[PDB]
Amino acid sequence: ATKVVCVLKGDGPVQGIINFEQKESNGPVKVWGSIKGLTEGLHGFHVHEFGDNTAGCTSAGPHFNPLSRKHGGPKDEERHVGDLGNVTADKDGVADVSIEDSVISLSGDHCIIGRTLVVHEKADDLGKGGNEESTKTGNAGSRLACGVIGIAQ
Amino acid sequence: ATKVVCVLKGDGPVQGIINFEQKESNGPVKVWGSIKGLTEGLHGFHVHEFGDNTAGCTSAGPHFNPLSRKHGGPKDEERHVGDLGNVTADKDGVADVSIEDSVISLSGDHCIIGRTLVVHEKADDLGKGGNEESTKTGNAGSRLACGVIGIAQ
Ligand SMILES: *[Se]c1ccccc1C(=O)Nc1ccccn1
Ligand SMILES: *[Se]c1ccccc1C(=O)Nc1ccccn1
Ligand SMILES: [Cl-]
Ligand SMILES: [Cl-]
Ligand SMILES: [Zn+2]
Ligand SMILES: [Zn+2]
Ligand SMILES: [Zn+2]
Ligand SMILES: [Zn+2]
């Protein structure tokens, strides 16, 4: 079982640790951990293309999209590979994260190792906003914190 | 072909950006960039096993060592895959880094993508210091800055 980990840091107080674990190729990835310092409610949660922090979270580039599709929710067929939807921050600003996804992988051309996990300013509208931005970024706004996705023990 | 990047950060003044590029699947990797905030002289420069920054640079684990060998300089047959030797900081505290290595890879068994680049406090003794520390860490001492090695544009 491939085990990977991401430490989210940014300019502000948003920080967290997210774990990923995949039992087989093309099988589901379990994604779990916590993020603190968030405003209460929905925050867009995406794998972006580049493991490049040279200019903070900006250098991570767009949502990881090797199939060249439009933005969606994780349950949509039409989605970016990086589209993990929303995490929910409780009133204390802590998001417990627990997601299962079969589109991201820890091997092959959909592999997210060496790419960047980003937690966003606002809710992802899951491609249902009816503007161009909806079908690119989900209108989730600015990058609060990010980390390069690395191999764990 | 494959281009990757690492942003080195820590709890002190050491900061840098290191690029890796590999033209052919199994050929040499070009390593270049710059690190600032260092003491003048030699600093150990290693790929460590885990792309895990949960507890700062300490969580990166030992030198990346898939062939279970003892520590050496990059030109030793007996070396860790992660053994890239030393970088040299000038009087200004800046190491201009430029290395070519054919034991690290950006593909396959010796691939360093999603692992951690660390720059150390002291010189790597290349395993010739005459103690246990020498043949594991090269006595390069404390981890000043590290980053997960990520996919670049
Ligand atoms: Se999983 C990962 C992360 C970064 C770069 C390459 C890979 C990878 O596993 N790719 C790959 C190529 C061919 C067959 C299987 N995996
Ligand atoms: Se390059 C890398 C980094 C992390 C995990 C896997 C890989 C990778 O590329 N593996 C691989 C599999 C098959 C053929 C070539 N590379
Ligand atoms: Cl949970
Ligand atoms: Cl050497
Ligand atoms: Zn995003
Ligand atoms: Zn998307
Ligand atoms: Zn080291
Ligand atoms: Zn070593």
PDB file of all heavy atoms in Angstrom, chain A residues 26 49 63-71 76-82 102-104 109-111:
ATOM      1  N   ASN A  26      -5.289   1.996 -10.002  1.00  0.00           N
ATOM      2  CA  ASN A  26      -6.659   2.309 -10.485  1.00  0.00           C
ATOM      3  C   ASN A  26      -7.681   2.099  -9.357  1.00  0.00           C
ATOM      4  O   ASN A  26      -8.867   2.393  -9.616  1.00  0.00           O
ATOM      5  CB  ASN A  26      -7.026   1.491 -11.730  1.00  0.00           C
ATOM      6  CG  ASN A  26      -7.883   2.251 -12.726  1.00  0.00           C
ATOM      7  OD1 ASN A  26      -8.092   3.457 -12.592  1.00  0.00           O
ATOM      8  ND2 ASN A  26      -8.381   1.554 -13.735  1.00  0.00           N
ATOM      9  N   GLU A  49      -1.463  21.115 -10.678  1.00  0.00           N
ATOM     10  CA  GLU A  49      -0.577  20.400 -11.630  1.00  0.00           C
ATOM     11  C   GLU A  49       0.875  20.317 -11.116  1.00  0.00           C
ATOM     12  O   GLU A  49       1.484  19.258 -11.265  1.00  0.00           O
ATOM     13  CB  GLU A  49      -0.609  21.138 -12.960  1.00  0.00           C
ATOM     14  CG  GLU A  49       0.004  20.347 -14.102  1.00  0.00           C
ATOM     15  CD  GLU A  49      -0.100  21.037 -15.448  1.00  0.00           C
ATOM     16  OE1 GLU A  49      -0.794  22.064 -15.523  1.00  0.00           O
ATOM     17  OE2 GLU A  49       0.563  20.573 -16.403  1.00  0.00           O
ATOM     18  N   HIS A  63      -5.710  23.348 -11.698  1.00  0.00           N
ATOM     19  CA  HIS A  63      -6.120  21.999 -11.225  1.00  0.00           C
ATOM     20  C   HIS A  63      -5.441  20.968 -12.125  1.00  0.00           C
ATOM     21  O   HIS A  63      -5.400  21.191 -13.330  1.00  0.00           O
ATOM     22  CB  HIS A  63      -7.647  21.812 -11.243  1.00  0.00           C
ATOM     23  CG  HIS A  63      -8.392  22.718 -10.319  1.00  0.00           C
ATOM     24  ND1 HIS A  63      -9.771  22.823 -10.349  1.00  0.00           N
ATOM     25  CD2 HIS A  63      -7.955  23.596  -9.384  1.00  0.00           C
ATOM     26  CE1 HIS A  63     -10.154  23.712  -9.449  1.00  0.00           C
ATOM     27  NE2 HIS A  63      -9.059  24.217  -8.854  1.00  0.00           N
ATOM     28  N   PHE A  64      -4.914  19.893 -11.554  1.00  0.00           N
ATOM     29  CA  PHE A  64      -4.314  18.759 -12.297  1.00  0.00           C
ATOM     30  C   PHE A  64      -5.382  18.182 -13.231  1.00  0.00           C
ATOM     31  O   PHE A  64      -6.433  17.753 -12.742  1.00  0.00           O
ATOM     32  CB  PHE A  64      -3.779  17.710 -11.329  1.00  0.00           C
ATOM     33  CG  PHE A  64      -3.122  16.514 -11.977  1.00  0.00           C
ATOM     34  CD1 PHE A  64      -2.239  16.666 -13.037  1.00  0.00           C
ATOM     35  CD2 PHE A  64      -3.361  15.239 -11.492  1.00  0.00           C
ATOM     36  CE1 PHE A  64      -1.622  15.563 -13.613  1.00  0.00           C
ATOM     37  CE2 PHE A  64      -2.739  14.136 -12.063  1.00  0.00           C
ATOM     38  CZ  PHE A  64      -1.890  14.298 -13.133  1.00  0.00           C
ATOM     39  N   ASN A  65      -5.116  18.215 -14.539  1.00  0.00           N
ATOM     40  CA  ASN A  65      -6.122  17.981 -15.608  1.00  0.00           C
ATOM     41  C   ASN A  65      -5.469  17.293 -16.806  1.00  0.00           C
ATOM     42  O   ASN A  65      -5.408  17.866 -17.890  1.00  0.00           O
ATOM     43  CB  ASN A  65      -6.763  19.290 -16.055  1.00  0.00           C
ATOM     44  CG  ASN A  65      -7.952  19.057 -16.962  1.00  0.00           C
ATOM     45  OD1 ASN A  65      -8.533  17.963 -16.976  1.00  0.00           O
ATOM     46  ND2 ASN A  65      -8.336  20.091 -17.680  1.00  0.00           N
ATOM     47  N   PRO A  66      -4.945  16.059 -16.654  1.00  0.00           N
ATOM     48  CA  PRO A  66      -4.253  15.384 -17.759  1.00  0.00           C
ATOM     49  C   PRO A  66      -5.201  14.925 -18.879  1.00  0.00           C
ATOM     50  O   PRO A  66      -4.700  14.656 -19.951  1.00  0.00           O
ATOM     51  CB  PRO A  66      -3.601  14.174 -17.077  1.00  0.00           C
ATOM     52  CG  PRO A  66      -4.548  13.867 -15.927  1.00  0.00           C
ATOM     53  CD  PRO A  66      -4.974  15.243 -15.433  1.00  0.00           C
ATOM     54  N   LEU A  67      -6.517  14.840 -18.617  1.00  0.00           N
ATOM     55  CA  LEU A  67      -7.529  14.423 -19.632  1.00  0.00           C
ATOM     56  C   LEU A  67      -8.115  15.650 -20.339  1.00  0.00           C
ATOM     57  O   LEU A  67      -8.963  15.460 -21.219  1.00  0.00           O
ATOM     58  CB  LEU A  67      -8.627  13.598 -18.962  1.00  0.00           C
ATOM     59  CG  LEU A  67      -8.152  12.347 -18.228  1.00  0.00           C
ATOM     60  CD1 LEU A  67      -9.325  11.510 -17.752  1.00  0.00           C
ATOM     61  CD2 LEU A  67      -7.248  11.501 -19.105  1.00  0.00           C
ATOM     62  N   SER A  68      -7.686  16.858 -19.975  1.00  0.00           N
ATOM     63  CA  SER A  68      -8.123  18.139 -20.587  1.00  0.00           C
ATOM     64  C   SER A  68      -9.656  18.268 -20.536  1.00  0.00           C
ATOM     65  O   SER A  68     -10.266  18.579 -21.572  1.00  0.00           O
ATOM     66  CB  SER A  68      -7.595  18.236 -22.004  1.00  0.00           C
ATOM     67  OG  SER A  68      -6.184  18.384 -21.995  1.00  0.00           O
ATOM     68  N   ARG A  69     -10.261  18.042 -19.367  1.00  0.00           N
ATOM     69  CA  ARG A  69     -11.724  18.154 -19.146  1.00  0.00           C
ATOM     70  C   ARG A  69     -12.037  19.506 -18.496  1.00  0.00           C
ATOM     71  O   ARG A  69     -11.093  20.261 -18.208  1.00  0.00           O
ATOM     72  CB  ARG A  69     -12.202  16.947 -18.334  1.00  0.00           C
ATOM     73  CG  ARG A  69     -12.218  15.670 -19.160  1.00  0.00           C
ATOM     74  CD  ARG A  69     -12.724  14.448 -18.436  1.00  0.00           C
ATOM     75  NE  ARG A  69     -12.608  13.274 -19.291  1.00  0.00           N
ATOM     76  CZ  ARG A  69     -12.902  12.023 -18.928  1.00  0.00           C
ATOM     77  NH1 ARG A  69     -13.355  11.757 -17.713  1.00  0.00           N
ATOM     78  NH2 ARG A  69     -12.743  11.035 -19.794  1.00  0.00           N
ATOM     79  N   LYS A  70     -13.325  19.801 -18.321  1.00  0.00           N
ATOM     80  CA  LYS A  70     -13.833  20.963 -17.544  1.00  0.00           C
ATOM     81  C   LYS A  70     -13.840  20.589 -16.058  1.00  0.00           C
ATOM     82  O   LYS A  70     -13.824  19.389 -15.760  1.00  0.00           O
ATOM     83  CB  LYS A  70     -15.245  21.349 -18.005  1.00  0.00           C
ATOM     84  CG  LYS A  70     -15.359  21.726 -19.483  1.00  0.00           C
ATOM     85  CD  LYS A  70     -16.533  22.634 -19.808  1.00  0.00           C
ATOM     86  CE  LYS A  70     -16.751  22.833 -21.293  1.00  0.00           C
ATOM     87  NZ  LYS A  70     -15.595  23.490 -21.951  1.00  0.00           N
ATOM     88  N   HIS A  71     -13.893  21.591 -15.177  1.00  0.00           N
ATOM     89  CA  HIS A  71     -14.009  21.454 -13.703  1.00  0.00           C
ATOM     90  C   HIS A  71     -15.366  20.828 -13.355  1.00  0.00           C
ATOM     91  O   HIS A  71     -16.371  21.204 -13.990  1.00  0.00           O
ATOM     92  CB  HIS A  71     -13.860  22.827 -13.028  1.00  0.00           C
ATOM     93  CG  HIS A  71     -13.917  22.753 -11.543  1.00  0.00           C
ATOM     94  ND1 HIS A  71     -12.892  22.227 -10.791  1.00  0.00           N
ATOM     95  CD2 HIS A  71     -14.885  23.119 -10.677  1.00  0.00           C
ATOM     96  CE1 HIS A  71     -13.234  22.272  -9.515  1.00  0.00           C
ATOM     97  NE2 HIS A  71     -14.449  22.815  -9.430  1.00  0.00           N
ATOM     98  N   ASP A  76     -18.754  13.814 -10.469  1.00  0.00           N
ATOM     99  CA  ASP A  76     -19.011  14.021 -11.919  1.00  0.00           C
ATOM    100  C   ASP A  76     -18.027  13.187 -12.744  1.00  0.00           C
ATOM    101  O   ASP A  76     -16.874  13.003 -12.300  1.00  0.00           O
ATOM    102  CB  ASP A  76     -18.895  15.491 -12.315  1.00  0.00           C
ATOM    103  CG  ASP A  76     -19.907  16.388 -11.627  1.00  0.00           C
ATOM    104  OD1 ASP A  76     -21.055  15.930 -11.431  1.00  0.00           O
ATOM    105  OD2 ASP A  76     -19.540  17.539 -11.278  1.00  0.00           O
ATOM    106  N   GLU A  77     -18.469  12.723 -13.910  1.00  0.00           N
ATOM    107  CA  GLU A  77     -17.606  12.105 -14.946  1.00  0.00           C
ATOM    108  C   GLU A  77     -16.766  13.215 -15.575  1.00  0.00           C
ATOM    109  O   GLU A  77     -15.529  13.037 -15.691  1.00  0.00           O
ATOM    110  CB  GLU A  77     -18.448  11.358 -15.983  1.00  0.00           C
ATOM    111  CG  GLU A  77     -17.607  10.608 -17.008  1.00  0.00           C
ATOM    112  CD  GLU A  77     -16.638   9.592 -16.415  1.00  0.00           C
ATOM    113  OE1 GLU A  77     -17.077   8.786 -15.569  1.00  0.00           O
ATOM    114  OE2 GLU A  77     -15.444   9.611 -16.796  1.00  0.00           O
ATOM    115  N   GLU A  78     -17.397  14.333 -15.947  1.00  0.00           N
ATOM    116  CA  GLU A  78     -16.664  15.527 -16.443  1.00  0.00           C
ATOM    117  C   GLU A  78     -16.093  16.261 -15.218  1.00  0.00           C
ATOM    118  O   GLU A  78     -16.850  16.939 -14.483  1.00  0.00           O
ATOM    119  CB  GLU A  78     -17.544  16.394 -17.344  1.00  0.00           C
ATOM    120  CG  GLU A  78     -16.778  17.498 -18.064  1.00  0.00           C
ATOM    121  CD  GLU A  78     -15.883  17.071 -19.224  1.00  0.00           C
ATOM    122  OE1 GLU A  78     -15.819  15.860 -19.524  1.00  0.00           O
ATOM    123  OE2 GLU A  78     -15.254  17.951 -19.837  1.00  0.00           O
ATOM    124  N   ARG A  79     -14.805  16.038 -14.958  1.00  0.00           N
ATOM    125  CA  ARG A  79     -14.034  16.713 -13.888  1.00  0.00           C
ATOM    126  C   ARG A  79     -12.549  16.671 -14.240  1.00  0.00           C
ATOM    127  O   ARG A  79     -12.118  15.807 -15.072  1.00  0.00           O
ATOM    128  CB  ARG A  79     -14.253  16.030 -12.542  1.00  0.00           C
ATOM    129  CG  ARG A  79     -13.875  14.558 -12.546  1.00  0.00           C
ATOM    130  CD  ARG A  79     -13.863  13.935 -11.166  1.00  0.00           C
ATOM    131  NE  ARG A  79     -12.569  14.031 -10.483  1.00  0.00           N
ATOM    132  CZ  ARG A  79     -12.267  13.401  -9.350  1.00  0.00           C
ATOM    133  NH1 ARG A  79     -13.153  12.629  -8.750  1.00  0.00           N
ATOM    134  NH2 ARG A  79     -11.064  13.538  -8.817  1.00  0.00           N
ATOM    135  N   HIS A  80     -11.798  17.578 -13.620  1.00  0.00           N
ATOM    136  CA  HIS A  80     -10.321  17.523 -13.571  1.00  0.00           C
ATOM    137  C   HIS A  80      -9.959  16.343 -12.677  1.00  0.00           C
ATOM    138  O   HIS A  80     -10.693  16.077 -11.735  1.00  0.00           O
ATOM    139  CB  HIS A  80      -9.749  18.837 -13.022  1.00  0.00           C
ATOM    140  CG  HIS A  80     -10.137  20.038 -13.800  1.00  0.00           C
ATOM    141  ND1 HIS A  80     -10.322  21.275 -13.223  1.00  0.00           N
ATOM    142  CD2 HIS A  80     -10.332  20.206 -15.117  1.00  0.00           C
ATOM    143  CE1 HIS A  80     -10.611  22.146 -14.163  1.00  0.00           C
ATOM    144  NE2 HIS A  80     -10.621  21.515 -15.322  1.00  0.00           N
ATOM    145  N   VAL A  81      -8.841  15.677 -12.922  1.00  0.00           N
ATOM    146  CA  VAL A  81      -8.366  14.611 -11.995  1.00  0.00           C
ATOM    147  C   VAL A  81      -8.184  15.222 -10.590  1.00  0.00           C
ATOM    148  O   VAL A  81      -8.521  14.541  -9.624  1.00  0.00           O
ATOM    149  CB  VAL A  81      -7.083  13.937 -12.524  1.00  0.00           C
ATOM    150  CG1 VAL A  81      -6.375  13.128 -11.450  1.00  0.00           C
ATOM    151  CG2 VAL A  81      -7.398  13.053 -13.729  1.00  0.00           C
ATOM    152  N   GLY A  82      -7.735  16.475 -10.481  1.00  0.00           N
ATOM    153  CA  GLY A  82      -7.485  17.151  -9.186  1.00  0.00           C
ATOM    154  C   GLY A  82      -8.737  17.568  -8.414  1.00  0.00           C
ATOM    155  O   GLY A  82      -8.582  18.092  -7.285  1.00  0.00           O
ATOM    156  N   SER A 102     -11.593   7.712  -6.606  1.00  0.00           N
ATOM    157  CA  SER A 102     -11.114   6.680  -7.562  1.00  0.00           C
ATOM    158  C   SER A 102     -10.565   7.324  -8.835  1.00  0.00           C
ATOM    159  O   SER A 102     -10.214   6.572  -9.765  1.00  0.00           O
ATOM    160  CB  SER A 102     -12.218   5.700  -7.859  1.00  0.00           C
ATOM    161  OG  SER A 102     -12.566   4.994  -6.677  1.00  0.00           O
ATOM    162  N   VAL A 103     -10.446   8.655  -8.896  1.00  0.00           N
ATOM    163  CA  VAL A 103      -9.939   9.319 -10.132  1.00  0.00           C
ATOM    164  C   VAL A 103      -8.469   9.706  -9.923  1.00  0.00           C
ATOM    165  O   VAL A 103      -7.651   9.427 -10.820  1.00  0.00           O
ATOM    166  CB  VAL A 103     -10.848  10.496 -10.532  1.00  0.00           C
ATOM    167  CG1 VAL A 103     -10.255  11.316 -11.667  1.00  0.00           C
ATOM    168  CG2 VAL A 103     -12.237   9.982 -10.907  1.00  0.00           C
ATOM    169  N   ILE A 104      -8.140  10.353  -8.804  1.00  0.00           N
ATOM    170  CA  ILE A 104      -6.721  10.557  -8.396  1.00  0.00           C
ATOM    171  C   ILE A 104      -6.116   9.168  -8.233  1.00  0.00           C
ATOM    172  O   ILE A 104      -6.908   8.235  -7.938  1.00  0.00           O
ATOM    173  CB  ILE A 104      -6.573  11.379  -7.108  1.00  0.00           C
ATOM    174  CG1 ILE A 104      -7.260  10.715  -5.915  1.00  0.00           C
ATOM    175  CG2 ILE A 104      -7.032  12.813  -7.334  1.00  0.00           C
ATOM    176  CD1 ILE A 104      -6.871  11.312  -4.566  1.00  0.00           C
ATOM    177  N   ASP A 109      -0.352   7.823 -14.828  1.00  0.00           N
ATOM    178  CA  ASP A 109      -0.411   9.177 -15.446  1.00  0.00           C
ATOM    179  C   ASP A 109      -1.341  10.091 -14.625  1.00  0.00           C
ATOM    180  O   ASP A 109      -1.196  11.320 -14.768  1.00  0.00           O
ATOM    181  CB  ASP A 109      -0.794   9.090 -16.930  1.00  0.00           C
ATOM    182  CG  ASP A 109       0.330   8.569 -17.823  1.00  0.00           C
ATOM    183  OD1 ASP A 109       1.370   9.256 -17.927  1.00  0.00           O
ATOM    184  OD2 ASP A 109       0.168   7.472 -18.404  1.00  0.00           O
ATOM    185  N   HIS A 110      -2.240   9.522 -13.805  1.00  0.00           N
ATOM    186  CA  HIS A 110      -3.138  10.252 -12.862  1.00  0.00           C
ATOM    187  C   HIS A 110      -2.489  10.399 -11.472  1.00  0.00           C
ATOM    188  O   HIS A 110      -3.217  10.754 -10.504  1.00  0.00           O
ATOM    189  CB  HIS A 110      -4.489   9.526 -12.718  1.00  0.00           C
ATOM    190  CG  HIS A 110      -5.363   9.608 -13.921  1.00  0.00           C
ATOM    191  ND1 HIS A 110      -6.710   9.258 -13.875  1.00  0.00           N
ATOM    192  CD2 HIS A 110      -5.104  10.012 -15.186  1.00  0.00           C
ATOM    193  CE1 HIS A 110      -7.236   9.434 -15.071  1.00  0.00           C
ATOM    194  NE2 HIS A 110      -6.268   9.898 -15.896  1.00  0.00           N
ATOM    195  N   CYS A 111      -1.200  10.075 -11.343  1.00  0.00           N
ATOM    196  CA  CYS A 111      -0.494  10.036 -10.043  1.00  0.00           C
ATOM    197  C   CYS A 111      -0.318  11.473  -9.551  1.00  0.00           C
ATOM    198  O   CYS A 111       0.051  12.333 -10.371  1.00  0.00           O
ATOM    199  CB  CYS A 111       0.862   9.353 -10.165  1.00  0.00           C
ATOM    200  SG  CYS A 111       1.742   9.291  -8.587  1.00  0.00           S
TER     201      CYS A 111
END
